[PDB]
């Protein structure tokens, strides 16, 4: 189906004369495959996934070269953003950045991204047309003008519409047993006694990939959203993901409730009921 | 693959 490649950069300034912290990780869909850490001893772009280890020295020496430049250009941005907001040198601030491309089912380009953040808040971001910029505040407005003058948008669009989907298509085909795979949820539901009158039915969804999933609790009517409890989708640590939804029910009426599970691996939605 | 050109803020 639809796929994506994402790069996440985290630049954190250290108080005083402590060298800035830089972290860069790469994600294809929901799978991380590369990393870079400024506090590491290797000082190279490292493989996280085994399927990207196919690449020879030229790739890794190249990716190492380009990410070093990404670190230095962000060390500068930390200082520049400090001046824009009149901040002291004593405090610690964070600069974040993401760019990547989205493809269709036929792997044709769909969407491109390029965003910035400072101290947890949006700074400047490339609009969907890949022609304009969204500058939140008057400080970012300076960057917007600087990038409009140097025409950064056009050259970025070439990468997103072109080189990005070229890279993603390479990654998808190199290790297709890992990226193109779809692991279906292994579902079950457990029953628990709350005091005595009420009871908790928890619908479990385990060992599934991709991470996108929908768990709803429905009665004989339909979809009882609210009262039901939902938790954030969590990684199992083996590449797969976990998530459960639960709702408290009166005793005996446990047979009335059902759990709907929708996933990419599921050809049809699953309707699960509790039977004593 | 990351960008091959960098630009300050």
């Amino acid at each position, epitope marked *: 189906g639809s796929h994506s490649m994402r790069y996440f950069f985290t630049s954190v300034s250290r108080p005083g004369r402590g060298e800035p912290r830089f972290i860069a990780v790469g994600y294809v869909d929901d799978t991380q495959f590369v990393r870079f850490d400024s506090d590491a001893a290797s000082q190279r772009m490292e493989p996280r996934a085994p399927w990207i280890e196919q690449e020879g020295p030229e790739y890794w020496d190249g990716e190492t070269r380009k990410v070093k430049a990404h670190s230095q*250009t962000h060390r500068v941005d930390l200082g520049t953003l400090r001046g824009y907001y009149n901040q002291s040198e004593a405090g610690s601030h964070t600069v974040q950045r993401m760019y990547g491309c989205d493809v269709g089912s036929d792997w044709r380009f769909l969407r491109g991204y390029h965003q910035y953040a400072y101290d947890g808040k949006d700074y400047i971001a490339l609009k969907e047309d890949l022609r304009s910029w969204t500058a939140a505040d008057m400080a970012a407005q300076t960057t917007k003008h600087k990038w409009e003058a140097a025409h950064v948008a056009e050259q970025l669009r070439a990468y997103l519409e072109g080189t990005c989907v070229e890279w993603l298509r390479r990654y998808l085909e190199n290790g297709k047993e890992t990226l193109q795979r779809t692991d279906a949820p292994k579902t079950h539901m457990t029953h628990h006694a709350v005091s005595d009158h009420e009871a908790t039915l928890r619908c479990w969804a385990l060992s599934f990939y991709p991470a996108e999933i929908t768990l709803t609790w429905q009665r004989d009517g339909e979809d009882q959203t609210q009262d039901t409890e939902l938790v954030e989708t969590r990684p199992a640590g083996d590449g797969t993901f976990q998530k459960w939804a639960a709702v408290v029910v009166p005793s005996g009426q446990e047979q009335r409730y059902t759990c709907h599970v929708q996933h990419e691996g599921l050809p049809k939605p699953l309707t699960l009921r509790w039977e004593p | 693959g990351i960008l091959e050109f960098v630009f300050t803020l």
Partner: T-cell receptor
Amino acid sequence: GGITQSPKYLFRKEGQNVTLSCEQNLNHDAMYWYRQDPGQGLRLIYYSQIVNDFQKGDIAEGYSVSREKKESFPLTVTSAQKNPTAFYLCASSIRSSYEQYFGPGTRLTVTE
Amino acid sequence: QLLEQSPQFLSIQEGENLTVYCNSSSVFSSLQWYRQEPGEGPVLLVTVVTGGEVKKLKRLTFQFGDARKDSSLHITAAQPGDTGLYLCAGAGSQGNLIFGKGTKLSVKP
């Protein structure tokens, strides 16, 4: 503001190292080095997209640079260069891959 | 990523009109034109961005290809002062500029 090269003319003995200086106040992050033979075109030696980072060019052998300061970008012609004698040019752009502004240039001649 | 310029050498009479070409198989986000006199630093003439762009500088007239793969430099009423090397430059992917080998123009009086 502008971009400067010093000196205009440069003369050294064979095998003795020499360093060329390109300095700016145009507030540019990217700085470039080209060498140009008579009746020829520009050949990229070294270039830095940002301070504290640089990268080789097409004909980077025999040369070495440093980008510790945003304002300057020193080019060192090592003794290992087979044909040092050329016309050297420094250039800079507000960012990498954009329009570059060249310096006056420096003529280097190495004799036996 | 290559930029090719034709003709290499052009020697025409004063007062006439000419055209210098810069062609490439690659697409360019931005393209620059330079003019270099012997022994001196190249002077930036123009930077074209949008496809089909038409910009004028004095007697010089610049044209950007619709697909942004070609460019042309048109001089109107050529003067002996126009004598020099005209270079075509485009935005390289590796954080550099791709240069053409230039067109040496000789405007004879």
